[PDB]
Design an enzyme around this catalytic site. Structure first.
Site, PDB file in Angstrom:
ATOM      1  N   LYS A  42       0.893  -1.173  -0.042  1.00  0.00           N
ATOM      2  CA  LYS A  42       0.029   0.053  -0.007  1.00  0.00           C
ATOM      3  C   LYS A  42       0.906   1.308   0.048  1.00  0.00           C
ATOM      4  CE  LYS A  42      -4.255  -1.952   1.553  1.00  0.00           C
ATOM      5  NZ  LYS A  42      -4.278  -3.113   2.612  1.00  0.00           N
ATOM      6  N   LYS A 201       4.054   1.159   7.458  1.00  0.00           N
ATOM      7  CA  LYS A 201       2.985   0.641   6.901  1.00  0.00           C
ATOM      8  C   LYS A 201       3.204  -0.798   7.426  1.00  0.00           C
ATOM      9  CE  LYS A 201      -0.977  -0.267   4.798  1.00  0.00           C
ATOM     10  NZ  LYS A 201      -0.980  -1.405   5.943  1.00  0.00           N
ATOM     11  N   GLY A 203       1.717  -5.192   7.293  1.00  0.00           N
ATOM     12  CA  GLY A 203       1.181  -6.164   6.425  1.00  0.00           C
ATOM     13  C   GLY A 203       0.646  -7.274   7.263  1.00  0.00           C
ATOM     14  N   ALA A 204      -0.186  -8.107   6.960  1.00  0.00           N
ATOM     15  CA  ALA A 204      -0.536  -9.361   7.376  1.00  0.00           C
ATOM     16  C   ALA A 204      -0.892 -10.345   6.171  1.00  0.00           C
ATOM     17  CB  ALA A 204      -1.721  -9.026   8.549  1.00  0.00           C
TER      18      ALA A 204
END
Length: 255
Positions: A42, A201, A203-204
């Site tokens: 993103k 930022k 993340g998963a």
């Protein structure tokens, strides 16, 4: 070493690249091992959007329907009837990890293939976007689709946020959104000392992939670029945020 012990404690594989941009000192640990990047993408996606859009272009209202909505849309789900400006989408994507917002922005820049091409142009030969959310999370071990490395993600983030890939006002926009992220409190933010500013930022992903990339600012000194990536051996594995906070503490110590 301390990273190996964290891997043992949390039964996860760690990927770390930290660069002190003031000194060129690094902290590395499996810096070139691949991980599904998950929502960290993103940040690089807004980086490319900012390359392509003027500030006023970001006022363009984007309309979408309930059909555009995917699995994790905390902001976009609330604005179907009204639409959202590109600026509002960027905000939601970065600060809330809104997946629909990511998909809409990705479309604006030409999709995953165009994202990849723009990353290749900036010298990222590693990051491999192929898909929209949430299926970019469908990564199995051994696969390179929708993966990057700690080194490449940090470098590409550095490129947009700290280097001349964006002009200063756009760099500042990106940073401000990332400083004001709502999703990263237990990750890199939880592993830095007081007075360090964080622009991250998260993340998963599948296989308990749990990532955080950031620019971090010591109270005094140049920014540090940090990518902390992780994954586990079971597809349905749960992550522990503490792994990332603890790895960050090791990074901060070593620097």
């Amino acid at each position: 070493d301390d990273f190996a012990k964290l891997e043992e404690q949390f039964d996860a594989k760690l990927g770390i690249f930290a660069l002190d941009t003031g000194t060129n000192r690094t902290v590395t640990y499996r810096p070139d091992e691949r991980f599904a990047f998950a929502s960290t993408i993103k940040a690089l996606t807004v980086g490319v959007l900012l390359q392509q859009k003027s500030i006023e272009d970001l006022n363009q209202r984007i309309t979408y329907t309930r059909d555009d909505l995917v699995n994790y849309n905390p902001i976009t789900e609330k604005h179907v009837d009204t639409g959202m400006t590109l600026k509002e989408l960027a905000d939601a994507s970065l600060r809330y990890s809104d997946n629909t917002a990511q998909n809409l922005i990705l479309k604006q820049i030409g999709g995953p293939e165009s994202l990849k091409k723009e990353l290749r142009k900036i010298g990222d030969e590693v990051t491999n976007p192929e898909r929209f959310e949430p299926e970019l999370n469908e990564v199995n071990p051994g696969e390179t689709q929708d993966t990057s490395t700690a080194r490449a993600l940090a470098t590409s983030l550095q490129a947009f946020a700290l280097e001349d890939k964006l002009p200063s006002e756009k760099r500042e926009l990106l940073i401000d959104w990332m400083k004001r992220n709502t999703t990263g409190d237990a990750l890199i933010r939880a592993g830095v000392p007081e007075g360090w500013e964080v622009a991250d930022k998260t993340g998963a992903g599948s296989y308990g992939t749990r990532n955080d990339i950031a620019i971090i600012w010591p109270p005094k000194g140049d920014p540090v670029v940090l990518a902390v990536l992780s994954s586990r051996d079971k597809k349905d594995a749960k992550y522990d945020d503490k792994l990332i906070a603890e790895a960050t503490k090791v990074v901060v110590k070593a620097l």
